[PDB]
Structure formats: structure tokens, C-alpha cells
């Protein structure tokens, strides 16, 4: 259907970040289902857990009688709108060394598939980090030793997640923490490694480490450079498209050239397990900074164990 | 790229440009005029940047004409191969379901074979993936969908140990919106065992499945992958160049030549007066910025005035360049256009018929072999009779059989020289009978009217 | 030790360039225009070094048209040679495994034979290798893959002592990157005994395997190296001159002449007004740099002014050069194009058919002998019958058999002058029969329906 | 590659957003031409010893094949090292403490390429780095090895270490010896043979004996993935020293991860 397919010379640099981090690649921790929905929200209501459902009793004394009521909680799923800047397709001028410039549509399409994948992944990761920070589930390791431990850092995160630590089965992280892990694995101060097993991507508990260089997991520079790795439960982060991709090509002939312009719109829903987006505090159409800003995400589930995710911060 | 399932082989990247250009040529003039910048360069880049220059280029392409001999050529070759119907050898009732609906859409195996022939004639590549759902399905895979393969020598034998082909589908939601769900299929062969894993995309997703080994009727898995890649050259994983590249290039050259010729025809095809030797005093006083040219009134001109109707003449050098382009297309082609001016000796073409139909026979034989192998694989799914043959029409230059031909085939059948089924196949081929030989037999067994 | 398994003979190195250029000519317009740098010299080297010169040269090449009649030549020759199907004589059910998948990859021996015939017609070289896995496999060694051979007399006889060829493959890993790893086979013959090694290359080393002596089913090892090299001339280790040289050179000359002619078409093909005897003052008064040239509007000129359209006229000397080169390409005998205007009086085509078909018959005989030898060697490996044959279609210009021809063949079978299998062979060549003769006998033995 | 393709959108607001263009980049592949000095192979000097004159041609042929393989390999490695130095993908161990091969150095070179560090396939190095690695492994201060697995060629995370005594990687002398171990992805070093191999044997007269000279000359294209050669700074047909100098190449790919190759200076 594409007018021109991509040839060997048209090896446009696709991307520099791995963006295959959905379902099976991430053991279902970050899902990318497809379901169109109207409005700027998609909220669902479930019954809350009664606090004093079971109470001590004194049969001998009638005394008073307590009163209890049952409430309803509200899950939420914000809709994030994205788009493509107007793209100036060259007007048959890039020809002296290039074979032809008319394949701009195809190169834009391919790079745009790659970049929308990376954009969805980055927004999901930033929203997850912000929500987990809002939930009080952040562990900071910046003052202890070098800044990262081999596995003693992961054990702190599972300690925070608690008695239900077993259901965390995925770690996503930047590549720098992984390389520090390899460095400390290849330099075993506690002799629990042999050369055959120094390349393990697990965390001594069966949880694999998935590596991506999303900028949502790295901030600052030099001494202020902190890498944020966040452990995910099953289906912690939900990203749903609305299958409403739009495009147009307009020839603005008057403005000194026909000036083939390419536009695109697409929107996707994003929602973190156990958390809700504070639309009143945030906005109807949040930007990546609005998603990444704490206090725009409100914890819904009463127990931290039900909320899916924990953030580990290392320098 | 990298280790993704959707990694595309470097040679597919070799051939994508030519495949796309051939697809544009087959599609018609809409794709060509929409993607004209690929073929016809701007007559001036400095003006190409200029708005007036790009407007001139738009008018230049608009006035052009696309001859469209490529699509007509491929259609003619298709009609030559697919005259009457292919012959299927073996039990018809045991393979009736495969014949009637090859892939569950009511699409006969003959029409899918026609699609295979079209893609092998145009792009010189294709595919026939046979899978098990109970009933076997013989899928059709486009040339640009086979995006990865491997070739290894195991026990001194050539074998394909990997073959990845992309796959598209339509999603069923409650609404009426049309999506495009992409599926990846990975066929592998480890230790002489056929394996098959499905990769699904939902918004750029990967639904990974378990490694499963489809089994035959008795079991025992498979020795080789149930996939065949057919082309114009041979049924090989190696890439076969399309048989239509030269004709497409010639049509592109003809298209740009016709663009130039049409520009000339529009600009300077109208005769013009060019009233030489006029003083503006004369023009203002008597002409008044207007000339009546009809036969009723005569225009007076001063002394030493030479009016000369001026226009470009015929038999131009651009026009005859286009003419030799058309001649080279006809000469470098097979059954593409007809010329009523030309006369050809009968019987003389009998010797060149062998070379003229070369790609026709090659494609017919390759598609017949591919479909025979796929049918055998489906038989191993169903445990049916192995010796089954799918033979396409290798008898080109199909025409109505003459009375002498029919008499000769009848005389040959009357002796133990032609099998009765062969004679009936002849006489249906010549368009003298349409009932199945079985029905004709049961009808003609009874006594004659008299 | 020598350790020069990759060494290539000097004459093979000499022929690499011609082989590559023949491959490019067969490839199509894309390969030639990618490397038109050699075939088309720049019209001016002084400009060729300069940047505007290279821009002009690119615009010059892009307008050129690769006629590409060498590909049509080879296609027609192959179609004439490989029409119908080459006949295998011998016990078929013992040899069914070889006929079905000749190298264990599902390709019938006919398709590999077609590939070998194309390689012999194109660049006049090839190679068939038979080795033991239990099953023998008939390899196909590409013309460039045979990189060393040696000819030494023992007991006053032509015996081949050393023969090295490259075997290509793709590495089998779990990932999706495609390596390209080569294994070199050293076929050696010492004191009339066939030995074999394979050289492997991985992780910065060069493997060597043990000498082995492949044996027949009856033992007794071997006396001849099971490798045959065929070509246009004959089955000799020495290179046979490629048959496409003349066509390739003529096509390159036609390509550069087409480049020149297309540059002329672009520049001087369109007419121009060329107003002579014109002053600047008149132009700035009324012309103003814009001359409406429609039939509606007339434009005046000063006294003693002359307009004159000027475009290149047809039948130019460059065009006649291209025409003579095309006629030469026809004259060298290649079945490359047809001509609708030409009319030939029948009765004279058969006079010179044996001369037009010379290389076709030569290649047919050479490939038939090579495949016969390979089949004999495979039979020796299996210890089966040795009186087996493999012959290609040696009668070109095939066509539908005439009713008179059919009657004559049938009457020939009535007398004990032509065999029944021969009659079936001819009737199938005439396209007057399709099913196997055994099925014919089984059907026709039963009584007539009456 | 277009940097900003996704933009935070506001369906409820109408505002202007700046446009973006399409860029293009050029790869490069310099052509290197080599040859053989004239070789005297007079037939008289071989018939006096009673030897076939073609033996000299055969000897020259085998030595020439070996030396041609060597020359292309060495020039490719030198150009690769120079390009990787130009592109900024260099890690130095010579400064960091004691500069000897250790798994830590391989991990540090693996630190470059970020998340895409698996694409590095092999390590090409001089023999001295491998033997220093062996010496480190023999006295394993960190208990990583046993005598059974003390020798591992495919050392760094399953990547083979491929050894060749190429003078290009040495680039040092005496104390200031700086061996260079460079890691490569698939297709890192590109070397094409232009198959223009001339081999003429010219013979003369006028001397007491017939004289013969062997003269062979060819060429081969050389290139590195993701890098371009600078003709304005370089030369038409560069000698190995011209290739070996950094700043004679320049990186064209937007990301280092596309330009396969990491060089590690080891002293």
C-alpha cells in the first residue's frame, strides 16, 4: 500500500532506545492493549475494603452499638493526546546526492512508528514513576557507599513492597545501573560468583532486569545524576490506544513553495494500577511533564501491596 | 532490525525499490502521477524551488500521458497461461474441500493460482504457507511479506532453518472502524523438527506463543518446513529478479518522453500569426490591438510586411524517440500490444513460439510445482493419497480447435493411442465440450435416439 | 605448510571481471546505472572532476535507457532448451528420491538443470558435485565458486588431481542477524583414489578435517573425483568463452548511444521561437519578456525581423547508429527481440535453423552429459543400475502437433517402426497428451464403453 | 533522523507549532590501491640450478596472496581504530590505575553503546593483551576462575577474543607501548575487492642474460559502518599513515550506537 518501500540506502536511523517492553517482553507488567474510548477520562468504580469489618466483642456487656458504612472507590484512566510537528517534505530539491526526495512519506511513516512506540513507553514510565513517588513507595540509595549495590538494593525494594513481595516479577532500568551491576558482579567482594554466572540479568530472586535508555529513568548530571529503576507487578501500567490515527498532506502553494506538510494525531489512554489521575489538580489533556509531576496522581487502593510498583533510585 | 521478529533481510532491502516501482506500474497512472518525482525529474531545479517552477512542473506532469503497456502485458501473459483451467490429478472427492475453498473464503484454488501466477510474472516472487487450524489451509504470502530466511547445509543437504513472513489482518470490534492488526509467523527447523511460533501485534505489541510442532496424520512431526517460495527463476529462498523490470523501465522512459512531447504540443501546436514588419502607428490606427482572421474580412498591412503562420511540424525528433521507445517495448516483450498495420507470416512464428513463451512456461511450471508441493503437504496433514498433481495450462496460443483437429483427436482415441480422458481434455480445451467426462459417459451409455 | 586453500588461478581471476559484467548485464537497468561510471565515459574529464560536472553526469545517466536485450536473449534460449521436461531413462522408483529433491531442498532435478543451463548459456561455466550424506546429493556449484583446479597425467591419461570450490551458507543461531560463513572443500585424487577435506573458519582460525575416502555401496572407494565442470564448449576444467560477450558489448554501446540520444532529446528536442532581427527597445515596449503564443493571440515584429522554430530533426546520425547496433544485436543470432513489420518466407527458416540453434544444441549436449555423469556417480554411491541417462530437449522450435503430424506419428506406431513410448513422447512434445503412459495403459486396457 | 517527531498535543487549544525539515547524510568508502615492487625472475638463474622458471611465479603468487590478505586486514584495522577515535568511542585503561586487560576493562568498553551493548560481537586484539589477560586469570585475586576454566578465548560475556599480531593495533614502543583492543559489531569493517588485478611479466634484452620482472597491482575499497572519510583533509589514494590518523574521519550517524565499534587502549 505504501507508495515506496524502504531500500538499503534508505536506512534512516530508526531509533536508539529499545521499545519492545510490552506484555511478554515485560511479563505483562506493561500492557499495550487496544480499546477506543470517548471523552478525556475512563473511570471505573469498585467496592472499597471495610476497615473495621471484624471487631472485638464483649458478650457480657450490651453497652453501645457501633455503626458502619460501605463506600465506593473510583479507578481512573487519563487520556494523553500526542501529535507530530508539521513536517517540511523537501520540494524535489534534495536530489544532487540523494536518489529521490519523494520517499519522505515512507521515511516519516517508519520513523514515526518507532517514535510513537518510544513516546508511549516514555510516558508510561514517567507516569509510573510519578505515581509510585506519590504513593510513598520510593527507595533512595545515594548516600550509602558508591550508590548502587549488587542485589542488596533490590532487597530493599522488596522489603518496602512487603509480605506480598513475591508478585513483583519485572525490573525496568537504565543501562547504567546494569553496567554497574556487571562491574560489581565481575568484582565479587563476597565470593558468590563464578566466571560462568557473572552475566546474570536476574536479581537473585527470579526477577529479570529489562534495560532501556528512556530519559524518564535518568535525570541530572555528574553528582546530581540519579538513575531510577522501578519494579513492576503484573499489569502495573496500562497503555491503551484509541485506534484513531489521523494524517494529512497540504500543499501551501502560496507561501514561496508548495511546501508538502505532513501532520499526524493519535491519542492513548494511560493508567497506573491502584492510582488515579488528579484531573482537577492536573489537566484534561496532560503533557509529559504533567504526567511526570507528583500530586497529579492519587493513590486509590488502601494497601500499598495492591498498588503495583516500587521505584528504586540510585546514582 | 536487531533481533526483532520483524527484521528485514538486506536483500529484501535490495529489491523493495524495484518491487514498489513495478507495483506502481501495474496499478496504473494514478500512482505514477502521484509519485512522478521518482521518475520524471524537474526540468529545472532552480525553478523547482521557485513557486512558478513547481507550478510549471505540476502542469508538465498533468499534461503527460502514461502508455500503460506493463499492466496490459502482464494481463495478456496471465490470460495466456490461464486459458481454460488447470488439471488436478488424483482423487477429487478427497481433495474437494481444498479445491472449492483453499483458505476458507470460498476462493477456489484456481483463482489463488492465478494470483500466484500474477505475482510471479510481475514481481517474480511469492509464497504458499500451508497450515493446520480440522482442515488444512494453503495461505498466500506476498513478495514483500517474506522478510527473513536462512539456508544451512545439514548432513550435506540444503535446508531452510528459518523463514519469517509478516502477516496482516482486520480486527473485530463492536464498532465499524477499520484497523490493521499485524501478525508475525516464525517457522523454524531445529534437529530436523518443524516448529512454528506466532507473534502478534496490538498497537505495536508482541504476544509470544509457545513452541509447537504441527503433526501429520500418523504424527512424526515434519522433516521440512511447510513453506515454499516460488519465483520466475526457480523455487528458491534466493531472490529472483522480476521478469517485468525492462518493460517497466521502458514505460517510464516513454512516460517522460511523452511529457516533453505533450508540453511541446500544448505550447507550440497552435499556429500563430507573427506579423513581422509592423509599425506601432499602424497597429494603433487600423489594427487597434485586434485582428479578424476569418475568411469574410481581410487584414491590410503596410509595405514590407510578411505574415507567416508558425507552428511546430510533425515527425519531430522527440516524437520519433517515443516511437522507437514503443517499438523497443514491443520487440522486448510478449503479447503486450496489437498493431493492425502489421502483418506477420503464418507458420513462420512457429519457430519463435518457443522463445516468445519462455517466461510464460517458466512461471507456469514453477507455480505448478509449488502448488503440487503444497497439496502434498496438505495431504500429509490429512493422510491422503500422496501421488497428486496440480498441472497448469502449459499449452499457450489457445484457440478454438478446427474440424480437422477434432477429427484427428477422435481418430487417435479410437486407437489405443490417446487415453479417453486425454481426448476429452483436448476437446474441452478446444471448446467443443463442457460436460464432465463422467456425466457424458453416463448420458451416452444409453441407446441412441434413432 | 602452504595453507592457501583460498588461492585462485590466474586465469580465473582474469575471468572474474567478465563474469561480473555479464551478471550486471543480465541484472537489469539498476545495476548498470549504479555502475554506469565504467560503461559510459564522461563526455569531459575536466568537468568530470568538477562538481557541476558530476551533477551533469548524474542527470546524463539518469536519462539513459538500458535496452537490456541480453536478459531477453538468455530467457529465450532457456525457454527453447527447457520446453516441456527433460527425459530421464532408467529405473525411476529407485531414483525417485533424486528426481524429487535433487539436493534435499525440495527442488526437482529439472529446476536445477534449468539453473545449470542458464549458467552455461550466460557465462559458460558451472559445476555439479555429488557427495554422500543415507542419500547422495547433487550439488550445484556456482561458476565463481570453482576457484581452483589441477590437471595431471598419470598412465598417459587426463586425470583431475586437485579441485577446490567454495560452499556458502548462513549461520544457524537463535538470533535474527544473518551471517555468511563459507566452507572450502578440497577434492584431491592421489594414486587413483578420491579423497576429501573440508576447511572451516571461525573465531580467528582455519580448521582442517581428516582426509576421508568416500566409498560406493560396494566399497572399492573411487577412481575419479565426483565433480564435473560443464560449459558452452565442453565439459573441461579449462574455461569456456562466455557466449554473451558480443551481446553484452553491443548492449553497452547501445546504452551509451541511448544516453547521448536522450540528452539530445531533452536539450534540442523542443522547438524555440528564436526571434531574429530584434531590438531591446521593442521587447521592453511590447514583449516585456512574455510572448503569448496561442492561436487566439497574434504578436507583431519589427521591420526585417524573422522568427524561426528550431528543433533537432529526426533520423539523426546518432539514431542510425543505435539502429545499426540493434540490427547487429539481432544479426548475431540472439532470439532477443521480435519484429512485427518483418515478414519471412517459410521454407528458408529451416535452412539455417541448425545454425541459429548452434549454441543451444551445444549447451543441451554438455548439460545432458554432465547430469548423466552425476546420475551415474550417484548410482555408484547407492550401488544401483549404471545404464541410466539424462537428456534435455534437443528439438527446439516446439509447437502444437498438426493433425497430419499426429496421423503420421500414429501410423508410424501402427508399424513396428517407432516404439509406443516414443509415440507418447512425441505426442506430449506436441502438447497432445499430459498423463503418464502407464496410467494410459491402465485406463485403455479396459473394454470400450460402447 | 528527525529528532522531534512526537509533541504534547492539546485538542482544546489552537496554537502554532514550528515546522521541521528532513536531513540527509552521506556514507563514504575510500579506495586504497596497493602493488608489488618489480621482482627479478630471470630464467637463466633458475635453469642454472635446473628448475622450472614458473616456480618463481608460483612462489611469488603464494607469498603475494598471504601478504595481500595481511595488508587488507592491517589497513582495515588501522582505519577502524582511527575512525573510532575520531567518533569519540574510546575508553582508556592506561590512565586508570594499572593498564592491563581485565574483565573490568571489557565491561567499561561495554558501557558505551548504552542499552544496545549486545550488538558488539567480537574483540580484535594484539597477542599481548590476551597474554596479559591470561596472566591476570592465572593469579585470580577475585575468585572467578578454576584451573579447568582459566583459559577462555571467548571471554567477555561470550564475545570471542580474536588474536592477530597486526602492527596497526600496537602503536607504541618501549615503555610507552599502547596496545589497542577494539570491539566490533556485525559489518563494522567493510573491505571490497575491486577485482582490478593487473599482473604483467616484462622481459628485456641487451644484457648477458634474459631478464624478467614481475609487476602486480590492484586495489580494494575500505570503509567503516557509520563513518565517512574526509577527502578535503585526506588524500586521493591514502597510504596507511593517512588512514591511521584521527580527525581524518568523522562520525555521520546521529547516535554512537549505530556506528559499530569500541576501541580500548590497553598500554
Coordinates of C-alpha atoms in Angstrom, one line a residue, chain A residues 20, chain B residues 1-11 13 145-151 161-166 183-190 195-200 206-211, chain C residues 170-180, chain D residues 118-119 121 186:
Chain A
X20 CA 9.8 -3.7 22.9
Chain B
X1 CA 16.2 -4.5 12.8
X2 CA 18.4 -6.1 15.5
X3 CA 17.0 -9.4 16.8
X4 CA 13.4 -8.4 16.4
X5 CA 11.0 -10.8 14.7
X6 CA 10.3 -8.0 12.1
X7 CA 13.9 -7.9 11.0
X8 CA 14.0 -7.5 7.2
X9 CA 16.8 -9.2 5.2
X10 CA 19.3 -7.0 3.4
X11 CA 18.4 -8.5 0.0
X13 CA 16.0 -4.1 1.1
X145 CA 6.0 -10.1 3.2
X146 CA 8.7 -12.7 3.3
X147 CA 11.2 -10.7 5.3
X148 CA 13.7 -13.3 6.6
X149 CA 15.1 -16.7 5.8
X150 CA 18.1 -18.9 6.4
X151 CA 19.9 -21.6 4.4
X161 CA 16.2 -23.5 9.0
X162 CA 14.3 -20.2 9.4
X163 CA 11.6 -18.3 7.5
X164 CA 9.8 -15.2 8.8
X165 CA 6.9 -13.7 7.0
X166 CA 4.8 -10.7 8.1
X183 CA 0.8 -10.8 12.9
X184 CA 4.3 -12.3 12.6
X185 CA 4.8 -16.0 12.0
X186 CA 8.2 -17.7 12.7
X187 CA 8.9 -21.1 11.1
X188 CA 12.0 -22.8 12.4
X189 CA 13.6 -26.2 11.9
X190 CA 15.8 -27.5 14.8
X195 CA 8.5 -25.6 14.7
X196 CA 6.1 -22.7 14.5
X197 CA 5.6 -19.7 16.8
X198 CA 3.2 -16.9 16.3
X199 CA 4.0 -13.2 17.1
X200 CA 1.0 -10.8 17.4
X206 CA 4.4 -8.8 20.9
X207 CA 2.1 -11.7 22.0
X208 CA 4.6 -14.6 22.1
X209 CA 3.3 -18.1 21.9
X210 CA 4.7 -21.5 22.9
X211 CA 6.9 -23.5 20.5
Chain C
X170 CA 24.1 -18.9 6.6
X171 CA 24.9 -19.4 10.3
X172 CA 22.3 -21.0 12.4
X173 CA 21.9 -19.1 15.7
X174 CA 18.8 -18.3 17.8
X175 CA 19.0 -14.6 16.8
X176 CA 18.0 -13.0 13.6
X177 CA 21.2 -11.5 12.2
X178 CA 22.3 -13.4 9.1
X179 CA 26.0 -14.3 9.0
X180 CA 27.6 -15.6 5.8
Chain D
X118 CA 24.7 -6.8 22.9
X119 CA 25.4 -5.8 19.2
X121 CA 30.1 -9.4 18.6
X186 CA 28.5 -7.0 12.6

